[PDB]
Amino acid sequence: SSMQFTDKATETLNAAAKYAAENSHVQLHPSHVAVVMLDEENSLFRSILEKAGGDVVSIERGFKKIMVRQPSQDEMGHSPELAKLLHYAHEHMKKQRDLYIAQDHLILALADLPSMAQVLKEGGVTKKSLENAVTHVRGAYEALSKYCIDLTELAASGKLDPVIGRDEIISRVIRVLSRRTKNNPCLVGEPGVGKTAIAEGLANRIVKGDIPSSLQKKVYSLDIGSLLAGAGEFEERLKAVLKELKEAQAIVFIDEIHTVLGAAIDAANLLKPMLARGELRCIGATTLTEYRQYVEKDPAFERMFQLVMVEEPSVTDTISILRGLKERYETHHGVRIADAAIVAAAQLAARYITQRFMPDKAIDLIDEACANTRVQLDSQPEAIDKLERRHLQLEVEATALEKEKDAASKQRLQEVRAEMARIQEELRPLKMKYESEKGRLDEIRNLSQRLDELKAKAEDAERRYDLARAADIRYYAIPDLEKRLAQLQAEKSQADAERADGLLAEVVGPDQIMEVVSRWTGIPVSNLQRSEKEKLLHMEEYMKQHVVGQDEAIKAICDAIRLSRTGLQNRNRPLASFLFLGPTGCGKTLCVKELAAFLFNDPGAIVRIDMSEYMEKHAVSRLGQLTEAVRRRPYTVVLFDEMEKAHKDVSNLLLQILDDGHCTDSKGRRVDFKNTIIVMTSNLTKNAVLATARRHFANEFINMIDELIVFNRLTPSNIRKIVDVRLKEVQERLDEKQITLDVDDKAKDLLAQQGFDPVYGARPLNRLIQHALLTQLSRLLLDGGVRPGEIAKVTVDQEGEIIVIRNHGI
Ligand SMILES: Nc1ncnc2c1ncn2[C@@H]1O[C@H](COP(=O)(O)OP(=O)(O)O)[C@@H](O)[C@H]1O
Ligand SMILES: Nc1ncnc2c1ncn2[C@@H]1O[C@H](COP(=O)(O)OP(=O)(O)O)[C@@H](O)[C@H]1O
Numbered sequence: 001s002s003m004q005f006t007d008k009a010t011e012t013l014n015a016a017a018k019y020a021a022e023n024s025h026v027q028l029h030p031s032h033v034a035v036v037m038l039d040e041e042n043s044l045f046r047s048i049l050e051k052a053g054g055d056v057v058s059i060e061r062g063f064k065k066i067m068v069r070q071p072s073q074d075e076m077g078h079s080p081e082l083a084k085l086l087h088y089a090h091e092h093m094k095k096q097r098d099l100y101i102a103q104d105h106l107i108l109a110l111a112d113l114p115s116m117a118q119v120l121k122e123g124g125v126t127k128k129s130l131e132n133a134v135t136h137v138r139g140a141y142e143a144l145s146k147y148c149i150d151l152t153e154l155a156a157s158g159k160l161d162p163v164i165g166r167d168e169i170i171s172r173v174i175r176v177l178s179r180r181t182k183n184n185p186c187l188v189g190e191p192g193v194g195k196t197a198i199a200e201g202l203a204n205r206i207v208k209g210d211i212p213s214s215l216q217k218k219v220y221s222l223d224i225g226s227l228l229a230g231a232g233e234f235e236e237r238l239k240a241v242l243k244e245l246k247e248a249q250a251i252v253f254i255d256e257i258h259t260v261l262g263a264a265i266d267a268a269n270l271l272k273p274m275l276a277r278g279e280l281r282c283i284g285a286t287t288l289t290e291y292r293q294y295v296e297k298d299p300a301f302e303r304m305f306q307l308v309m310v311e312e313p314s315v316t317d318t319i320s321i322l323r324g325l326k327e328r329y330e331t332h333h334g335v336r337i338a339d340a341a342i343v344a345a346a347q348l349a350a351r352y353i354t355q356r357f358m359p360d361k362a363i364d365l366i367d368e369a370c371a372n373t374r375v376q377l378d379s380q381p382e383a384i385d386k387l388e389r390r391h392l393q394l395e396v397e398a399t400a401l402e403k404e405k406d407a408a409s410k411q412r413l414q415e416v417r418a419e420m421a422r423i424q425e426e427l428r429p430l431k432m433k434y435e436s437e438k439g440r441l442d443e444i445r446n447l448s449q450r451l452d453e454l455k456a457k458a459e460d461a462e463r464r465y466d467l468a469r470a471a472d473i474r475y476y477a478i479p480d481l482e483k484r485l486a487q488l489q490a491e492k493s494q495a496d497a498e499r500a501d502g503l504l505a506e507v508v509g510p511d512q513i514m515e516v517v518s519r520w521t522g523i524p525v526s527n528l529q530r531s532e533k534e535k536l537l538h539m540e541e542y543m544k545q546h547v548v549g550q551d552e553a554i555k556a557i558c559d560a561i562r563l564s565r566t567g568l569q570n571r572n573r574p575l576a577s578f579l580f581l582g583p584t585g586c587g588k589t590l591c592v593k594e595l596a597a598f599l600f601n602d603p604g605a606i607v608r609i610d611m612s613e614y615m616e617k618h619a620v621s622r623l624g625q626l627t628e629a630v631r632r633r634p635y636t637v638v639l640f641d642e643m644e645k646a647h648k649d650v651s652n653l654l655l656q657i658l659d660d661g662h663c664t665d666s667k668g669r670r671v672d673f674k675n676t677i678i679v680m681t682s683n684l685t686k687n688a689v690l691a692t693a694r695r696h697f698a699n700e701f702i703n704m705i706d707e708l709i710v711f712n713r714l715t716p717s718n719i720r721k722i723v724d725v726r727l728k729e730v731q732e733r734l735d736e737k738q739i740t741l742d743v744d745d746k747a748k749d750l751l752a753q754q755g756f757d758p759v760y761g762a763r764p765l766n767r768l769i770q771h772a773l774l775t776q777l778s779r780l781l782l783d784g785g786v787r788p789g790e791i792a793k794v795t796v797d798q799e800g801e802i803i804v805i806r807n808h809g810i
Pocket of ligand 2: 546547548549550583584585586587588589590722761762763
């Protein structure tokens with residue numbers, strides 16, 4: 001009588017009693033209940049009877065026959081046979097060890113009522129048909145372990161870091177794998193962009209069930225180098241691998257897949273038949289250049305693989321990747337990574353590690369900086385070590401004196417005990433403050449590592465439906481450790497506030513990241529912590545360090561660079577474009593050198609094109625070569641000397657790049673120029689020469705250009721300054737011998753007037769300094785004439801030539 005029901009069961013009964021009242025019936029009858037249930041939106045009872053084999057349309061009419069006979073008049077009582085339905089529901093509820101009468105308890109109870117059981121027999125439902133349908137609704141590979149990595153196992157064991165910000169590509173891999181043709185994804189990108197992480201991320205989704213049911217598959221990574229180690233036995237190992245994949249019906253990730261298709265033994269004829277018979281399902285990884293040689297060039301591989309590009313993440317996306325990996329390195333090294341460390345890792349790796357790719361190179365900075373911090377933390381503090389070591393000396397000295405009986409030994413022993421005790425008074429506090437801070441910090445680390453191991457074991461128990469083990473872990477072990485960890489994080493914060501030493505020892509901040517970046521690059525830290533904004537605002541100072549007398553040209557160059565870097569220029573353009581119109585010998589090439597060294601980190605990242613040899617009419621086909629230079633190093637200045645020599649074939653090739661942003665290769669490929677600067681020189685007061693230019697040029701190509709600079713002639717004061725900086729370069733070499741190069745006005749005037757020519761500028765200057773100064777200077781350094789620590793005087797002799805006065809005879 002006094003029973004407990006689910007809300008859904010109570011709703012069924014109330015609905016049964018309202019249907020009873022709608023046929024004006026005196027009291028509620030199990031056929032009311034049965035019919036109400038069969039008619040519920042998305043009826044359970046209907047689905048159970050369909051699965052038990054029943055004829056739901058006859059069963060319902062049969063229930064409606066018993067229901068029609070029930071007596072009528074004109075509150076709601078229970079039929080003796082309803083009261084019996086609830087008795088049996090309640091007995092099922094107890095047999096299943098359930099606590100509330102649920103709607104499947106009513107369905108099973110209908111079958112206990114002989115009247116209701118008959119209707120179900122006449123619809124084909126036996127009692128074993130009905131019981132089975134409701135019980136339902138409630139509830140080794142040798143070569144793969146030698147040669148592959150079970151990548152879905154790593155995911156299930158927690159041994160695999162999170163994969164952040166690649167959910168579009170992972171889901172694209174899943175759609176490709178599900179195509180009828182071209183259903184083998186080939187991850188194509190450069191080293192370190194995360195091609196392997198995309199395979200690892202799919203493994204992760206497979207283990208969590210965020211996949212279609214057609215990809216509940218293991219993912220094995222084929223170790224190609226492991227196939228070759230220890231030797232035609234390559235072919236026999238691979239066949240056994242492919243056989244065992246095929247029957248575990250797994251997906252195979254193959255890194256460096258080109259090295260098994262031609263790049264060192266070739267197994268293309270082993271893989272190809274299997275990939276085509278669909279026997280093998282495969283995820284490749286390789287680089288774009290190698291995809292084009294070994295997968296496109298074979299028509300039958302192109303027909304089975306799909307190119308999936310994996311681009312390098314930007315600085316913004318790398319910071320997101322780092323914020324996601326952060327806890328994993330913190331828990332591993334026992335350190336705190338400040339967010340500014342992350343930001344500085346991504347920004348400095350983007351700007352100073354230009355030979356390597358995101359996110360690998362930034363992660364790599366973090367790891368090294370974390371390892372540095374933990375080395376320091378694990379090192380003995382110097383003050384405790386100095387005292388421990390001096391106390392050890394004293395104690396060995398006391399052992400020796402302990403048995404000497406002369407007065408002088410007794411006296412020295414008392415001095416030794418007094419110095420021992422003094423050290424102990426200074427040492428004991430320092431040692432117990434180190435042992436408790438270090439001990440606490442270690443325990444935070446150890447507990448944090450056990451919390452991860454527990455969470456993974458608990459997530460494993462849950463997927464396997466091991467409730468007892470997941471229950472021990474989630475509710476007893478994890479909370480026990482979380483509480484202890486919380487106590488220590490509180491003790492630590494109080495202990496740090498009471499030291500007030502201003503020291504964040506366990507903290508990897510920007511200083512630590514730059515210590516690494518300095519080391520990896522040899523650039524001192526001081527040069528590293530200017531922002532990109534300050535370097536850009538002083539860019540003019542950078543060039544003024546070597547380019548003399550061209551202050552106007554430098555302002556124009558630098559402003560145009562700043563337009564690009566502030567994002568104010570059109571994306572469908574190159575970074576910048578200048579036409580250097582000045583006298584030769586004044587510093588056109590020097591400015592290009594300066595740009596590559598400032599704008600790209602690499603002074604040699606310049607691509608030169610003489611145009612007199614590209615004056616041929618079909619020279620553009622050979623430009624070919626132009627495409628492959630800025631594909632290979634995309635961050636590059638692109639210098640065009642003798643632009644006069646340029647045919648109107650090549651003139652209109654730049655107008656593409658300049659108004660489009662990329663050149664189309666002679667094979668159809670797009671070679672990107674969005675990170676090149678483009679410079680063009682031409683030999684062709686100030687206010688007049690600019691207009692002699694204008695009388696020549698096609699306007700649509702010159703307005704496409706950012707700046708048109710007019711360089712100015714080296715004036716006699718710029719002439720002395722250029723020669724004074726060359727002598728400074730000579731001095732910088734003599735400083736390790738402590739020599740001083742005193743050059744007088746007579747000689748600087750000789751270098752001034754004889755080192756500079758009216759049309760070829762400062763080109764003569766350097767041969768003159770080698771022949772007229774450094775040659776005799778080299779003779780004097782060798783024969784003792786000028787010695788370390790001396791002044792080497794330079795003047796001009798009575799015949800008219802540079803002389804280096806000598807300080808000693810031969
Ligand atoms: N999206 C990402 N999220 C987290 N870690 C990533 C991501 N992409 C790459 N990584 C990590 O960066 C490093 C380089 O990636 P990896 O997959 O090995 O590159 P590739 O296979 O292209 O050479 C690895 O430590 C990898 O775990
Ligand atoms: N204004 C300048 N300041 C310092 N050195 C200069 C200057 N102009 C030219 N030079 C020096 O002259 C040398 C040759 O000059 P270069 O770049 O070939 O002349 P341009 O390209 O303008 O015809 C370079 O090594 C450079 O150091």
